[PDB]
Design a protein around this ligand. Structure first.
Ligand code: HEM
Length: 195
C-alpha cells in the first residue's frame, strides 16, 4: 500500500481508537519501528493485516468493524490533512468526484492501485455506488460513506444492491438513499438534475 494513506490509518487508529498503548504496541512494537514515511513513499502490506488483527484481538472488536470505524473517522483525518476537495460541495458531488479523484491521485504515482468508485444518480433521493478492487475492503468503503454523511451533515441509508467478481476483481454495489432529495426534474430538461 502507499505511504500516505497508511499515514491516516495509524493517525485515525490512535486519533480516537483504542489508545497509544493498544496499537502503539502493534505499531512501534507490533514488529516494526515508530512511524511510516509520508511524502509519496511506499510501504509494506499484510503487516497492516496483522496489526489490524492484533487490534481486534487487543480491543474486543471484530477486525471488520475496526476497518469500518477507521473509515468513519478517517474522513475527518482526511478533512484535517489537505482538504481541497471538501470546500464547496454537498454530499453528492463529493461522492461523485471520488472516482476521478482516486485516479488522479494515482496518475503520476507509479504502482498505485486505487479502487474504482463509480457513482450514478438513480432517483431524486438516491445514487448507486460501485466499489471495484483487487482488495476487498468492503468495510472501509462503507465507513467512508457513513463518515462522509457525518462530516457534511446529511442523513442517509445505505443498502447493498449486489456483489460479485469479474475478471479478477471484487465488486460491491450499494444504493445510497438521501433523507432530503439531492436531484430534481427541471422543466424542459431530461433526467435527474442536481438540484
Ligand atoms: C468517500 C470517499 C472515499 C471512499 C468511498 C474511498 C474508498 C477507498 C478505498 C475502499 C480504498 C482502498 C480500496 C482498495 O483498493 O482496496 C481507498 C484508498 C485510497 N483512497 Fe480513498 N476513499 C475515499 C476518499 C478518499 C479521499 C478524500 C482521498 C484523498 C483525497 C482518498 C485517497 C485514497 C488513496 C490515495 C487510497 C489508496 C490508493 C493506493 O492504494 O495507492 N480517498 N479509498
Amino acid at each position: 500500500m502507499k505511504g500516505t494513506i497508511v499515514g491516516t490509518w495509524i493517525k485515525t487508529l490512535r486519533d480516537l481508537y483504542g489508545n497509544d498503548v493498544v496499537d502503539e504496541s502493534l505499531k512501534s512494537v507490533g514488529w516494526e519501528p515508530d512511524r511510516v514515511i509520508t511524502p509519496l513513499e511506499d510501504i509494506d502490506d499484510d503487516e497492516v493485516r496483522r496489526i489490524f488483527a492484533k487490534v481486534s484481538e487487543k480491543t474486543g472488536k471484530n477486525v471488520n468493524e475496526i476497518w469500518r470505524e477507521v473509515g468513519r473517522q478517517n474522513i475527518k483525518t482526511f478533512s484535517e490533512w489537505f482538504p481541497s476537495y471538501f470546500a464547496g460541495r454537498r454530499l453528492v458531488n463529493f461522492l461523485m468526484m471520488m472516482d476521478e479523484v482516486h485516479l488522479q491521485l494515482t496518475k503520476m504515482i507509479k504502482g498505485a492501485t486505487p479502487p474504482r468508485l463509480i457513482a450514478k444518480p438513480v432517483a431524486k433521493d438516491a445514487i448507486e455506488m460501485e466499489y471495484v478492487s483487487k482488495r476487498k475492503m468492503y468495510d472501509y468503503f462503507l465507513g467512508l460513506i457513513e463518515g462522509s454523511s457525518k462530516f457534511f451533515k446529511e442523513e442517509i441509508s445505505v443498502e447493498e444492491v449486489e456483489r460479485g467478481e469479474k475478471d479478477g476483481f471484487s465488486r460491491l454495489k450499494v444504493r445510497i438513499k438521501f433523507k432530503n432529495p439531492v436531484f430534481e426534474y427541471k422543466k424542459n430538461v431530461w433526467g435527474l438534475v442536481p438540484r
